[PDB]
Amino acid sequence: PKEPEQLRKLFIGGLSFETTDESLRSHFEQWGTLTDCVVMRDPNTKRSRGFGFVTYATVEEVDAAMNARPHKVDGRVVEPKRAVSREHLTVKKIFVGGIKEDTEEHHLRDYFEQYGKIEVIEIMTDRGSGKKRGFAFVTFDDHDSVDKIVIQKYHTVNGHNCEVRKALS
């Protein structure tokens, strides 16, 4: 079963107005098979609107393209992003809930470091008693880690099934 198409799209902002469907394709085919590749244009002038999207055959190919940032396409550094949810923002921090009183920093680090480079791990404690409250925040150096994390259906850390959400600052 193919992964859902929505999870195989990369939305590319910041394009050069000279980038075409064809030149965007030739660039991003370096990291996988593309089933779709679109530059958005004005319906009347045909002038570029400066953004588009590509669709890879697999999620691993999306990962390969994101791991190859920064992407300079037709002379300009562009901004690729995975699909955002409706309401959500592009952030570098997550809330991790349901970790209870026995989960330590190294449990969170060993798991989440495989999504991206961690900068801060904050295990929350009670302001009055100092006891652990059962949730934590993890900050990464880049938003794609968070984008990969929050689209997973399940997160298991230290045996616990955790609730993970984007955290706004």
Ligand SMILES: Cc1nn(C)cc1C(=O)NCC1CCC1
């Ligand atoms: C979801 C989503 N997440 N991001 C970052 C962009 C989208 C999106 O739906 N873009 C609209 C299409 C691009 C051609 C029209």
